[PDB]
Structure formats: C-alpha cells, structure tokens
C-alpha cells in the first residue's frame, strides 16, 4: 500500500466529491492478460492442430446465450440447501 508523493490533481472539493460518489484497474489487467492468452493459444494451436481451428472472437443488452427460461431459481435449490 503506497502513498502519492506528487501534487494531487484533485482539489479538496473533488476528493470530497469523489467520496460522496477488488480494483477496476486490477481487472483491466486481468482482461488484457486474458486477451493475450487467447491470442497465444490460437496462434500456437493452428501450428499444432491437424484440423481447422477458428480464430477466437450506454444501451441495455440482450444475452445471446442463456444457461431454461421457464425454470425458476427457487426450483433449482434442493430442500437441504433451503
């Protein structure tokens, strides 16, 4: 856990403003880590695959995939779980 030793670009109103309104940057690392590996895996896979390997791939969103719609979350719980 580290301290900033340079002038805080935010003035007191802004940091108090920030206070009124585990880490995002840490997940931004995880995402770009994940993006590289999918690129590494695909590139090497086509070298090492006999058979075709395809390339891996505001507003509210509809989900392409749904993991049945009629089934209810309550109905998916066992009596001992409840």
């Amino acid at each position: 856990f580290e301290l900033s030793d340079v002038k805080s670009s935010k003035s007191l109103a802004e940091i108090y403003e920030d206070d009124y309104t585990l880490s995002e940057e840490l997940q931004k690392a995880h995402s770009e880590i994940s993006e590289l590996y999918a690129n590494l895996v695909y590139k090497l896979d086509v070298l090492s695959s006999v058979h075709f390997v395809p390339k891996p791939a505001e507003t509210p969103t509809i989900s392409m995939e749904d993991a049945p719609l009629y089934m209810s979350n309550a109905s998916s719980l066992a009596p001992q779980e409840i």
Binding site: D19, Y20, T21, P60, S63, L69, S72
Partner: protein, 159 residues
C-alpha cells in the same frame, strides 16, 4: 423408386401406370411409336423412354412428385375407344374428437401449456440486463469526530 407404382410399355402403343397397393391401372397413354424401354430416375422426378422410331430418348416429368395423384382405376372402355376421396389420394386426417365422453387435447404444440403456467417467470428472466454545490457531508469523513462521540448522527428518494 418409391416401390409403389409400375409403369409398363406394350406393343399395342400404350403406356400404363399401375398402383401396386390397389393393383389397378391408374393412368393410360397412347404413344404414336411403341416405347421399347421404360426407366425411372433414381430421384423419380424424371422418366425416360425410347421408341421404335427416333434416335433420341424421350424424357417425361413426374407430376406426382409435385402433387398428389388420385388412385381411382382408369376407365378401360374409354381408353380402348381412344385407341372415399381420402383413400383416392392416399391420405388420412385424424378426426377432431373420436368420441365425446373421451378426453382430447388441443390441436397444437404441447409446449403451449408450460408457457402459460410459467409465463410470469419467463417475463422476469427475459428482462434485459441493466453534484450539489453545497454538498452535505458530515461526520468522521469531514473530521468532526466530536460529533460522532457525543451521539449526534434515500430509499424514498428512489421512490
């Protein structure tokens, strides 16, 4: 190809289609030149015939492959002079209700009933996925811990 019909050519200059299930002639033709050969296509949509005259091969289109054909027996006397509908078309439609006392379901898909019973949860699961200048901050955040010690200390706003 379906194994149901036989088409035969004879020296009397006629082509006859015979429906094997009923064992009767269903269509009759009179060819100007006797057809020496008769052959069906593997798909059955075409029929090839050769005749005593002509160096080519006559090709016919099987209309039965496009629409049903009545299997009523052909008139023998009428053909010579030229020279139950469901059974007739080889089909059956299930009756709406065989007997009144005996239960019958609706004429439609069986997933309809499940959709009706669980229509509510389908709606919920089918929903799509989702400052003031005088800011009023007080307490330990602003450094008056004395206020916290001495005891002095938005859902409707969402409403």
């Amino acid at each position: 190809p379906e194994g149901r019909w036989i088409v035969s050519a004879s020296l009397d200059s006629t082509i006859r289609t015979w429906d094997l299930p009923t064992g009767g002639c269903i269509d009759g033709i009179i060819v100007d030149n006797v057809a020496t050969n008769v052959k069906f296509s593997p798909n059955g949509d075409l029929l090839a015939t050769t005749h005593v005259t002509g160096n080519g091969i006559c090709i016919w289109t099987n209309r039965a492959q496009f629409k049903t054909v009545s299997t009523r027996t052909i008139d023998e006397s009428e053909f010579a002079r030229m020279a139950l509908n469901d059974i007739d078309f080889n089909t059956y439609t299930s009756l709406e209700q065989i007997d009144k006392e005996l239960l019958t379901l609706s004429i439609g898909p069986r997933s309809k009933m499940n959709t009706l019973l669980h229509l509510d949860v389908i709606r919920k699961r089918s929903k799509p996925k989702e400052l003031p200048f005088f800011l009023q901050l007080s307490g330990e955040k602003v450094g008056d811990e004395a206020s916290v010690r001495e005891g002095i200390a938005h859902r409707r706003d969402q409403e």
